[PDB]
Design a protein around this ligand. Structure first.
Ligand SMILES: CC(C)CCCCCCCCCCCC[C@@H](C)CCCCCCCC(C)C
Ligand SMILES: CC(C)CCCCCCCCCCCC[C@@H](C)CCCCCCCC(C)C
Ligand SMILES: *C/C=C(C)/C=C/C=C(C)/C=C/C1=C(C)CCCC1(C)C
Length: 227
């Protein structure tokens, strides 16, 4: 069907795949138990993204939703990806600063809410109500970011310098990249329809690769994953 955005879905497919393979090869060679746990989690992240990117490329995960007097193209496949990838990334961060079980539960719960309401909003047929779900989803995102910035950064002060320094960089990459998603959603096809789907796809691809492969390289190349 040659939709304008396929080139970005194809490029995201390739980068997510390359990233996954490389992390897989690199993780299989490691013998430290703790480093292996980080490797399995981190490898799974782009592996999942890969499948969803490839599916969308082949014409799946796309549904037309009515609102604003138009049949708007909505890629729901993105939420099936993010439902599992975002909490795994949070787990990597939590294991890094040795966060408590209660903290992890709250972050994942908040993450599930962010993705769930995000998807409900992306499927809502009442234009103005789309933004109510988006508002609720962004709020949950802000809760998560608050915890990583105020809770975790504090927690990282119990760890060695290199562990705290690695966490700060990953914390900063996450805060910057994650905060951008709601904005893209708002001005894109899911929201105000200002930015075209092809460009929107290009934007999500850059953020996704960065948030997963970029994040992954930073973490797995560090000495912080060793027990
Ligand atoms: C009209 C043009 C029809 C052909 C379009 C290009 C088809 C080949 C490229 C896309 C393919 C499927 C997606 C993944 C591509 C990975 C390419 C190598 C990355 C390394
Ligand atoms: C020692 C091994 C430590 C790592 C074990 C695997 C961690 C990643 C897989 C499990 C994760 C959490 C549960 C849900 C996994 C969903 C995976 C994608 C399903 C599609
Ligand atoms: C690999 C994917 C990552 C790191 C995805 C992060 C996605 C977000 C932080 C998404 C946030 C959203 C909102 C705040 C509100 C509207 C809908 C979402 C799900 C796009």
């Amino acid at each position: 069907t040659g939709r304008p955005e396929w080139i970005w879905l194809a490029l995201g497919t390739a980068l997510m795949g390359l990233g996954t393979l490389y992390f897989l090869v690199k993780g299989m060679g490691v013998s430290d138990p703790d480093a292996k746990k980080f490797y399995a989690i981190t490898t799974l992240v782009p592996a999942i993204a890969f499948t969803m990117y490839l599916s969308m490329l082949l014409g799946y995960g796309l549904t037309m939703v009515p609102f604003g007097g138009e049949q708007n193209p909505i890629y729901w496949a993105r939420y099936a990806d993010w439902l599992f990838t975002t909490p795994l990334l949070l787990l990597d961060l939590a294991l890094l600063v040795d966060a408590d079980q209660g903290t992890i539960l709250a972050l994942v719960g908040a993450d599930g809410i962010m993705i769930g309401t995000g998807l409900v909003g992306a499927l809502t047929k009442v234009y103005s109500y789309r933004f109510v779900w988006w508002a609720i989803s962004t709020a949950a995102m802000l809760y998560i970011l608050y915890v990583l910035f105020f809770g975790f950064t504090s927690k990282a002060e119990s760890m060695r310098p290199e562990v705290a320094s690695t966490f700060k960089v990953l914390r900063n990459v996450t805060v910057v990249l994650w905060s951008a998603y709601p904005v893209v959603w708002l001005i894109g096809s899911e929201g105000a329809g200002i930015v075209p789907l092809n460009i929107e796809t290009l934007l999500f691809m850059v953020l996704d690769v960065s948030a997963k492969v970029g994040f992954g390289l930073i973490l797995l190349r560090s000495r912080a994953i060793f027990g």
